[PDB]
Design a protein around this ligand. Structure first.
Ligand code: 7LH
Length: 84
């Protein structure tokens, strides 16, 4: 059915998104290794810079606040990975 074809396409997109989140995680781990800091590595200026750039590029069907929510979770995960 058409609905099953669309769900398959979304399923494959999920795995494409996962692969990029993982590649991004490896980059953020390397950033941790490079950056020699205080109690924690949180940098709100960096966060805001990334967020602004993502929103600048948001032509898609989601609201900017929704996109921000999702990327904040991605970032939070990156920081936690570094702090491992
Ligand atoms: O932006 C953040 C943290 C964002 C965050 C959002 C919600 C939270 O509840 C939280 O604990 C951290 O950190 C910068 C980006 C980074 O998380 C990334 O590129 O994945 C690396 C981190 O070292 C930066 O400070």
């Amino acid at each position: 059915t058409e609905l099953e074809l669309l769900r398959q396409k979304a399923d494959e997109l999920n795995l494409q998104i996962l692969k990029l989140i993982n590649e991004r995680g490896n980059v953020v781990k390397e950033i941790g290794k490079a950056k020699e800091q205080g109690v924690n590595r949180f940098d709100p200026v960096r966060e805001r810079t990334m967020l602004n750039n993502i929103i600048e590029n948001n032509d898609g069907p989601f609201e900017n606040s929704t996109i921000q929510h999702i990327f904040k979770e991605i970032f939070k995960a990156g920081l936690e990975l570094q702090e491992e």
